[PDB]
Write a structure and sequence with these properties.
globular, mainly beta, retinoid binding, binds sodium ion, monomer, about 55% strand, Lipocalin, about 10% helix, binds retinol, 10-stranded antiparallel β-sheet, 2 helices
Length: about 130
C-alpha cells in the first residue's frame, strides 16, 4: 500500500498555536514551538511504523502497529497519556487519541510528493505539509 518512509521537511504549518493552546500548553512553550519547524522522519515496514518528530528543542517518537491500540505517552508535548489507535482508512492513516481532550487525533496522507498531516483537538484543526529534499 502506501509507504511513508522518508525524511520530510516542514513547508506548511497553520494553526499550530491554536492547537497547542487547546492542549493547554503554556504560553512560553507555545512561543518557541511555533518557530520550531520540526522535521518528520518516518521508517516503515508494512503496518509497523516509527514516526520521529525532530526539533532542536525536543523530539517526539511514535512507535506502533497500524490497527493496534497502544498507550501513548505524550511527554514533552502536553505530558498526557492517551489510548491511541492509528488505522488505515484506504490510503490514509487515521489516528484517534482517546483521553482527556475530546476529538483528539490526526490524519496523515500523501498527495504526490507531499506528506499532509492534519492534527485535531476539540474542533481546532492544525494543517501541516511536508516534502522530502530532492
Ligand atoms: C509542542 C511541542 C512539540 C509538539 C510536537 C507534536 C504535536 C507532534 C505531532 C506529531 C504527529 C501528529 C505525527 C504523526 O505523523 C514538539 C514535541 C515538536 C517540540 C516540543 C513542543
Ligand atoms: Na519499537
Amino acid at each position: 500500500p502506501v509507504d511513508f518512509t522518508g525524511y520530510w521537511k516542514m513547508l506548511v504549518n497553520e494553526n499550530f498555536e491554536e492547537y497547542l493552546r487547546a492542549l493547554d500548553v503554556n504560553v512560553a512553550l507555545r512561543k518557541i514551538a511555533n518557530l520550531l519547524k520540526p522535521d518528520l522522519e518516518i521508517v516503515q515496514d508494512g503496518d509497523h511504523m516509527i514516526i520521529r518528530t525532530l526539533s532542536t528543542f525536543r523530539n517526539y517518537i511514535m512507535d506502533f502497529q497500524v490497527g493496534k491500540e497502544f498507550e501513548e505517552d505524550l511527554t514533552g508535548i502536553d505530558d498526557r497519556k492517551c489510548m491511541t489507535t492509528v488505522s488505515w482508512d484506504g490510503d490514509k492513516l487515521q489516528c484517534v487519541q482517546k483521553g482527556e481532550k475530546e476529538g483528539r487525533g490526526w490524519t496523515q496522507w500523501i498527495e504526490g510528493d507531499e506528506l499532509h498531516l492534519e492534527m485535531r483537538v476539540e474542533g481546532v484543526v492544525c494543517k501541516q505539509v511536508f516534502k522530502k529534499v530532492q
